[model samples]
Target: AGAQDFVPHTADLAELAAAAGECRGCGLYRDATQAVFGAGGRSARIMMIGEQPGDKEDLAGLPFVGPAGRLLDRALEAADIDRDALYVTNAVKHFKFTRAAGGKRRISKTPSRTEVVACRPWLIAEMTSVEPDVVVLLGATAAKALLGNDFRVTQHRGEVLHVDDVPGDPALVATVHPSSLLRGPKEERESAFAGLVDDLRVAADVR
Candidate 1:
């Protein structure tokens, strides 16, 4: 019914990435051009999860390569984090969008709770393999996926929590998504970006 149906039983990171191309866990894949899967070092100690793939990512078949991704790269650098050392991905593997008014562009839409649940098997498999020491949940979507719906990123932005019931049991840290910083009020942009860097710095402290 979910990734369990599409993913092979003995998949590792590479195999999982390949298998996701044929996923039919949810309807998002039907409209999307391709399945955008997670990427980065297989042995990374820090794993970062976002909401889902964006337009650029959907077309390129890669995660975190769009505008928001660029901003995240800057914040990670500012926090002295080595991007190569982190496994960056998303809660949902496909791009969920609606046709824009012009019928030329696609407007991003957040994945529904059902979609998140359906795709979780893949995320769980990823965690089982990466065995990250620190996990960064970017924005509410990602936070809610792993930390549950009650987890609020705004209130617990920089605090690290010990995540249980998963392989590695990595420390989880929640923070605002980079895209939010780009869309936030211009006057608050500076502080918001700083806050992201501050939360990312916490990952650096883990282990």
Candidate 2:
């Protein structure tokens, strides 16, 4: 038997963010600072998804504003995807971080399946609210949030996957998240960035 899914809903962005913040739907919220909901144009046609909130985002309360986010900005610029029109967010809503010995906050670990399941309703709400024409799952976490754990970002990166029955029909694309691109060596990173841009272009064109 499969997990019982939550019904998606259409919501305005401010309302959705307020609701998500109060959501202690998952155990991750027990350790994290706050719910980090999707950010950008309310009636956006494109949505860019990511894994979860990192340390920087946890402190800032905004999505994609850190180093990884900056890398994303670069890629989006290269690809000509409108960052303004692109609603950016994560699969999981909270920051799940571990405190280092020196009192510095390390990036929380990626969410477990149970945790992901717990927070999905909020994602459902956000998706239903925005009703984007195309959604881009930036990596496996975001992909799994929409698709399933078995969905592989590497295997499916360039494919225009169906965003099952939402707003009648919408497309979901996958790409290498900018964070992953930042970790590679120079030449490899450049190639990977180009690949990400290529994927974004395809995602932008999805009808």
Candidate 3:
């Protein structure tokens, strides 16, 4: 019920990442290969929040280094945002998944709200350290985590706004996760990707 114990409230970025590996804020640590911590500069101007780590991310021990991350790299480039000025992290630190019955394969599961709450301390620590000017919510999970259970990405996608509770009160923008661009409707694929780039452009324009 508490991650605050595992989190060093005033520690630096590298220290936070190293300490997260030992987090038992929830039972997710038992099954996950390792905590996939946030990555980017400690003082990046922009922060991108994604849903959770994928299988490859779990294995690699990094955020956004897999397929979706690669697509995000391209999308950021397309939107004219400097890659170095951005910080990338997930709503949940662990790769929450259920194993296939009688098989070795693992299938990703959307983390429950309880799980999100448990892992929030790490995200909060990252925000305070980074002090980003703009915070990009990359999916429903990431959006809802900060914006609350009622926020809908579809209704206000790409619209830059603000929130009061977060550390920096940074401008916020919502968009579909990069993974959706890879697995979504076949015909609208190109347009969907372009929309993602457009959403990112709005985020970049905010500050």
Candidate 4:
């Protein structure tokens, strides 16, 4: 159901990253510049799961290094969730986008549920490799990646959940991705950031 065939049985993060780059288990890899695997301390206690790479991330070959990353850095500072204590990654390892007329800036598209499922083994592998105490699913994509399609970040944001049968029994938390504060209506942006901080604070406490 996942990239299980491509997923090597390794506990090393770097090795995992190397293997992830060559993953042909999903269609997103075709348009993406490269696989943007999880990054941060191998043994970090917290793993912040993302939806997928944006334009910059696809180019940079790293996660959370774009505008949304900047916003997330601010939110992490506000919540006192030391960034180094976390591992940042996405559900799908590639960028899914559409470039219109003559190949200018590509418009980002949400990854399909099938694509998310296809990329999930690597996500779980990274989490297992890091052996984190908690995992934060930021956005519905990442939320559904591990928590299933029925899981809604909006309805259950900030709650500490426990998932059975996963490799490591990491505490699960779901919340809106930092990208929302950038795209959401201006009037609600401040509270949106606040809510993000509040939810991250929940993870910080459990961390």
**Cα lDDT of model 4 by residue, 1-207, tens digit:** 657888888888888999998899988888789999988988688899988989889999889988999999999999987898789999999999988898757678999998888888898788778888888889989888788789888999769988896678888899999988898677799989999999888987894
Q: Which runs in model 1 stand beyond 4 Å of their true positions?
A: none
* Cα distance off (Å), candidate 3, residue 191: 1.1
Q: What is candidate 2's TM-score against the reference?
A: 0.90
Global lDDT of each candidate = 0.88, 0.79, 0.88, 0.87
Please, what are the lDDT tens digits per residue for candidate 1 over residues 1-207?
Answer: 667788777538888988898899988889998888899867898999999998889998778888899999999999999998899899999999988566755788989888998999889888887888989999999999998877788999779888667577899999999989888677799999999999999988987
lDDT of 4: 0.87
CA displacement after TM-score superposition, residue 104 of candidate 2 (Å): 6.2
Q: Cα miss at 51, model 2 (Å)?
A: 0.9
Point out where model 3 deviates above 4 Å.
101-105
For all candidates, the clash counts are 0, 3, 0, 0
Residue range 20-129, candidate 2, lDDT tens digits: 77776667767777878888876888888898999899879999989999989988898887798888999887887777777755856878988787777776666777
* TM-score, candidate number 1: 0.95
Minimal lDDT window, size 10, model 2: 1-10
TM-score, each model? Answer: 0.95, 0.90, 0.94, 0.94
How far off is model 2, as Cα RMSD?
Answer: 3.0
Q: After superposition, how far is residue 101 of candidate 2 from its true place, in Å?
A: 3.4
